[PDB]
Design a protein around this ligand. Structure first.
Ligand SMILES: CC[C@@H]1C/C(C)=C/[C@@]2(C)[C@H](C)C[C@]23NC(=O)C(=C3O)C(=O)[C@@]2(C)[C@@H]3CCC[C@H](O)[C@H]3C=C[C@H]2C[C@H]1O
Ligand SMILES: CC[C@@H]1C/C(C)=C/[C@@]2(C)[C@H](C)C[C@]23NC(=O)C(=C3O)C(=O)[C@@]2(C)[C@@H]3CCC[C@H](O)[C@H]3C=C[C@H]2C[C@H]1O
Lengths: 145, 141
């Protein structure tokens, strides 16, 4: 709950390369013996820019689609940011999928560099998909502690 | 400073959803499948039976390019001495009875600012809502 130090990174421009798999019913192996489904998944790598076009870091992570008990469609992500000043911020959580163009967020944790020991929120919002491989995302990071 | 919680015993309550193809709503208009998911809550015990905390999270099934079936988890422990440790990552589904681990981040209490690894291994599944797990946490920095 303590918020002695604040880090507030706003207006991050996140150019994200998305590798997308459809998923579905497993085709072979051990998994085909079970009544499971492989969720659609997004493996992503992104460059992070400030509003001047200066790179401030990179991000990397995986998202998978699932549904909550009432049937609300969700995505779960595990990811981290590496910033140019030499520290890492992890972020992971579940967020509602629809609408796909509203802001999403999950909790974030600073693990090294100036971020260490600080916690808060990583946000991301899809602005456009210039091609099936690419997402232009507007992001922000708020950490305190 | 390093924290090494060995030999945690986890009594975990699992709600499983099988997922599948969406058949109504916005999702049915898109090329997607809902992966099988495990929502869980667990009580964490030391090797004496004393409760030291609780864990909560979700795991979801997916596959990597070469076809390896994986699970991705996002979770956190709240330890009774006041601190929280988040943990998340992807691990191989098979074999289902070997130890798995993902990265962990201490965020409050004596854990704040330390990072490392959360480990978990299935011991028994008496019913589809219940998993007995053997676990470990280590953090440093
Ligand atoms: C909840 C909506 C998300 C929010 C968002 C920005 C998330 C990410 C940054 C996530 C951390 C990695 C990510 N990047 C992504 O671009 C993304 C991702 O999950 C998508 O899911 C995708 C392609 C979708 C896939 C399935 C078929 C869909 O047709 C597809 C469409 C758009 C986004 C939807 C996104 O707007
Ligand atoms: C990859 C093996 C995991 C590792 C493990 C212990 C993981 C957890 C602690 C995870 C953090 C939540 C968890 N607990 C779980 O009990 C669990 C889990 O994902 C399962 O996947 C489950 C039931 C499965 C579900 C689908 C249908 C399967 O039939 C089912 C079988 C057993 C485990 C498999 C586990 O042995």
């Amino acid at each position: 709950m303590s918020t002695v130090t604040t880090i507030n990174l706003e207006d991050i421009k996140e150019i994200m390369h998305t590798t997308i798999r459809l998923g579905g019913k497993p085709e072979s192996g051990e998994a085909a013996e079970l009544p499971i489904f492989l969720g659609s998944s997004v493996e992503f790598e992104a460059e992070l820019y400030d509003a001047d076009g200066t790179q401030i870091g990179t991000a990397k992570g995986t998202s998978v689609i699932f549904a909550e008990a009432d049937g609300t469609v969700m995505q779960i992500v595990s990811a981290f940011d590496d910033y140019t000043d030499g520290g890492r911020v992890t972020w992971s959580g579940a967020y509602t999928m629809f609408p796909t163009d509203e802001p999403k967020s999950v909790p974030a944790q600073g693990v090294s560099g100036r971020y260490r020991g600080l916690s808060g929120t990583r946000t991301f919002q899809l602005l456009e998909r210039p091609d099936p491989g690419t997402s232009l995302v507007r992001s922000s990071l708020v950490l305190n502690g």
